[PDB]
Amino acid sequence: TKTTMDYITPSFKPKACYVTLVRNKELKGLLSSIKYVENKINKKFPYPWVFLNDEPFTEEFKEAVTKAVSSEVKFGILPKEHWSYPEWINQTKAAEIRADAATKYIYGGSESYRHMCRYQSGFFWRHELLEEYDWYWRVEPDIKLYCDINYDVFKWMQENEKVYGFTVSIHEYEVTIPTLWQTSMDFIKKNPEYLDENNLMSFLSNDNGKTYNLCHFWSNFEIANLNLWRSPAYREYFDTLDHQGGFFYERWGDAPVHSIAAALFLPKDKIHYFSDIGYHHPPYDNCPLDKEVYNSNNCECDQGNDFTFQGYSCGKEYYDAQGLVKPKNWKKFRE
Amino acid sequence: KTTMDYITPSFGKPKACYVTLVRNKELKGLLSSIKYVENKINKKFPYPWVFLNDEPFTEEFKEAVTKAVSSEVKFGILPKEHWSYPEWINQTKAAEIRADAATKYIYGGSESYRHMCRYQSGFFWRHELLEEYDWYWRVEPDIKLYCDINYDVFKWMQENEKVYGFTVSIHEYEVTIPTLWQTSMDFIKKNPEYLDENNLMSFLSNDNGKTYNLCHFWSNFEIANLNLWRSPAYREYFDTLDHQGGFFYERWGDAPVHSIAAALFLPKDKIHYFSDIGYHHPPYDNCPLDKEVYNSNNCECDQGNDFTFQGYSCGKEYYDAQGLVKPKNWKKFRE
Ligand SMILES: *[C@@H]1O[C@H](CO)[C@@H](O[C@@H]2O[C@H](CO)[C@@H](O[C@@H]3O[C@H](CO[C@H]4O[C@H](CO[C@H]5O[C@H](CO)[C@@H](O)[C@H](O)[C@@H]5O)[C@@H](O)[C@H](O[C@H]5O[C@H](CO)[C@@H](O)[C@H](O)[C@@H]5O)[C@@H]4O)[C@@H](O)[C@H](O[C@H]4O[C@H](CO)[C@@H](O)[C@H](O)[C@@H]4O[C@H]4O[C@H](CO)[C@@H](O)[C@H](O)[C@@H]4O)[C@@H]3O)[C@H](O)[C@H]2NC(C)=O)[C@H](O)[C@H]1NC(C)=O
Numbered sequence: 001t002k003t004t005m006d007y008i009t010p011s012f013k014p015k016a017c018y019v020t021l022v023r024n025k026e027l028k029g030l031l032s033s034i035k036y037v038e039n040k041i042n043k044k045f046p047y048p049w050v051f052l053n054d055e056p057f058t059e060e061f062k063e064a065v066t067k068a069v070s071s072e073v074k075f076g077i078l079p080k081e082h083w084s085y086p087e088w089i090n091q092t093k094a095a096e097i098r099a100d101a102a103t104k105y106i107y108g109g110s111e112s113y114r115h116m117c118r119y120q121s122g123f124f125w126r127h128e129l130l131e132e133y134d135w136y137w138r139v140e141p142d143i144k145l146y147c148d149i150n151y152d153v154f155k156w157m158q159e160n161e162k163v164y165g166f167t168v169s170i171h172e173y174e175v176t177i178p179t180l181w182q183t184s185m186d187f188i189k190k191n192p193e194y195l196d197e198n199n200l201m202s203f204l205s206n207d208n209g210k211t212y213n214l215c216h217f218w219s220n221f222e223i224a225n226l227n228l229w230r231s232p233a234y235r236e237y238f239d240t241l242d243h244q245g246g247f248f249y250e251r252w253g254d255a256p257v258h259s260i261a262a263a264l265f266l267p268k269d270k271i272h273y274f275s276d277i278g279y280h281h282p283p284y285d286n287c288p289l290d291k292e293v294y295n296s297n298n299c300e301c302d303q304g305n306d307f308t309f310q311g312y313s314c315g316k317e318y319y320d321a322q323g324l325v326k327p328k329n330w331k332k333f334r335e
Numbered sequence: 336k337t338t339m340d341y342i343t344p345s346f347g348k349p350k351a352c353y354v355t356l357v358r359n360k361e362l363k364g365l366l367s368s369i370k371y372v373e374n375k376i377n378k379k380f381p382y383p384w385v386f387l388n389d390e391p392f393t394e395e396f397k398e399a400v401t402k403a404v405s406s407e408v409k410f411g412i413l414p415k416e417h418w419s420y421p422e423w424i425n426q427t428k429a430a431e432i433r434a435d436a437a438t439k440y441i442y443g444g445s446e447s448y449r450h451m452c453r454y455q456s457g458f459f460w461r462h463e464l465l466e467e468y469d470w471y472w473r474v475e476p477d478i479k480l481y482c483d484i485n486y487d488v489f490k491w492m493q494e495n496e497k498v499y500g501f502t503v504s505i506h507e508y509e510v511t512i513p514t515l516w517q518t519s520m521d522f523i524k525k526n527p528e529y530l531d532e533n534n535l536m537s538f539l540s541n542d543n544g545k546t547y548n549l550c551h552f553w554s555n556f557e558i559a560n561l562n563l564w565r566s567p568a569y570r571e572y573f574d575t576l577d578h579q580g581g582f583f584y585e586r587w588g589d590a591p592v593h594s595i596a597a598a599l600f601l602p603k604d605k606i607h608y609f610s611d612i613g614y615h616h617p618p619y620d621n622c623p624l625d626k627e628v629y630n631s632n633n634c635e636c637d638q639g640n641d642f643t644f645q646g647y648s649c650g651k652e653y654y655d656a657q658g659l660v661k662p663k664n665w666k667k668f669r670e
Pocket residue numbers: 425426427428431432435
């Protein structure tokens with residue numbers, strides 16, 4: 001029997017790319033993100049940058065982006081089948097759901113946000129432009145890279161045999177994923193072979209699977225191996241969630257979907273937290289706490305606003321599940 | 336003598352200041368905010384800047400801030416009675432609430448955050464350093480002013496007799512304010528004289544006051560008349576909230592508190608929405624939708640991410656309560 005890791009070890013310069021799903025109307029915020037990535041790592045360790053959109057990019061947009069990125073840029077449009085209601089979804093039901101949740105939770109009434117979530121969950125890793133790569137680094141507009149990155153991150157992932165890399169983790173607003181967990185546990189019950197014997201269940205749960213603690217990796221920042229999403233386990237998992245309906249009948253985000261899959265389908269030493277990469281995605285920061293890393297890489301963030309060990313973050317849950325020794329002053333963040 | 340009677344007298348250059356409560360460890364984020372205020376308006380219309388901290392500011396902090404600001408700067412420490420548990424609060428109980436909520440909502444387990452909320456609610460406006468002023472402009476670190484502001488906002492508020500000025504509005508997480516509305520409604524039943532007959536109740540409630548829709552103005556951005564907070568109505572209202580205990584047994588923010596008071600205690604035409612001031616406090620923007628204002632003031636935000644009319648924002652509610660004509664494309668933001 002070929003296992004999930006059999007689909008990944010083969011890929012252990014790496015074939016990697018930055019990948020960005022973005023709207024034309026977000027040009028100023030994207031250009032900003034690009035300037036950070038350029039200055040902190042891309043001019044030193046260049047990798048192609050793929051930009052995707054559910055609509056065609058404007059010439060003004062492509063012209064601006066092409067000038068701002070020093071490495072090769074690729075622009076692609078999303079196939080409509082990766083951004084439209086599946087045949088089995090009741091659209092009237094979905095519309096009433098959005099109408100009702102319009103003011104209930106962030107993006108509650110948004111139709112586009114849900115297609116985006118489903119896209120990031122099961123289709124961005126199948127886009128034509130990503131076929132040739134084994135790794136991607138997701139980047140969004142209005143992001144900051146607080147520090148210089150003095151090593152090739154993709155190369156590091158390959159050499160160290162890591163599969164999923166992140167910076168921020170946090171507890172999800174449960175009102176958006178009421179049935180996500182139960183749906184995922186039934187999946188594992190019918191497919192025990194996909195549950196890695198040495199997985200990270202402890203990050204996701206405090207009672208060994210009974211319930212979800214809502215913890216997940218913040219997907220706006222990911223540096224991972226595309227073959228995880230391309231494995232049989234993940235494909236079957238996504239298809240199950242896709243038929244259940246939560247992307248549209250609730251508001252399932254790709255972050256909790258990617259995270260449950262990573263934390264359950266892989267040996268836990270395949271997940272890696274980039275404690276050394278300064279990053280901000282509104283409204284949270286990951287600011288290197290190690291003095292030497294912080295100084296050497298000229299980090300521009302306030303260590304005191306590092307979200308990692310704050311109550312609502314899941315940095316504590318992650319360190320404990322991995323067995324990592326938390327930095328000595330972590331408790332100060334819970335004040 | 337009613338509430339307005341305490342405000343009309345302040346209606347020479349107006350007595351005003353910027354006011355910033357901040358920590359020593361947030362210097363970089365504060366310096367960034369200062370750069371924005373300086374380049375967008377302070378160089379043109381200088382006003383003294385007040386910096387407050389529950390602990391003393393370091394020399395490094397003061398030297399860096401004095402240098403960054405072009406107008407006068409003033410540094411102050413908070414009286415301990417404006418930042419400590421009242422004698423009527425059960426601290427063991429407050430501690431249990433914090434521990435239990437650590438992972439339930441943002442700042443749920445934070446002790447310092449609650450002192451901060453109580454502070455912004457009932458004490459910043461009576462700090463000795465603000466006594467001589469009639470107006471204040473609250474500024475937080477990690478903020479952005481996206482556009483030029485080519486007129487003296489304080490002067491403008493004064494000439495037009497406005498009392499409370501804001502940009503972002505949003506629905507509060509009810510889990511942080513379960514009994515706030517009931518406490519506020521009993522206050523008004525007990526003090527009918529404080530409920531202005533032309534109040535903005537419809538912004539706060541969809542059922543004539545029976546329930547709170549959770550709408551409030553985002554207090555990180557406030558340009559307001561200090562005499563409102565100094566009025567008997569507000570003083571008594573705060574004292575009532577302070578005695579109820581919500582700042583500690585729940586997690587009452589100053590945002591919903593300031594808003595309920597403004598929307599109920601004043602004629603609704605004393606409240607003003609700065610549709611022309613580009614602003615960002617993570618993770619939301621107020622970006623001028625009016626193309627001429629956007630271009631004449633060289634805005635740097637993406638109009639496409641303006642938060643004002645998104646479902647979870649309260650811009651629609653505010654516009655409707657004020658009888659303001661919503662911009663032509665407002666519904667696009669609800670998609
Ligand atoms: C200031 O605030 C504090 C903090 O709230 C107030 O103290 C609290 O006061 C209430 C009411 O007086 C007490 O409630 C009683 O609790 C016991 C159970 O006690 C155990 O569990 C507590 C809860 O544990 C969970 O929650 C906490 C907090 O979130 C977590 O930390 C835990 O992990 C749990 O998740 C726990 O707090 C207690 O801890 C204390 O004691 C232990 C044991 O010695 C120590 O290790 C701890 O360090 C700590 O000191 C404790 O473990 C219940 O049994 C009581 O219910 C009975 O009585 C009621 C009376 O009205 C009745 O309605 C109930 O039905 C029930 O009665 C039943 O059983 C009776 C038994 O004879 C029968 O006679 C009866 O017919 C019926 O069948 C009650 O709920 C809190 O325990 C207490 N908390 C503390 C920390 O002291 C304080 O009062 C406030 N001060 C002021 C001035 O108001």
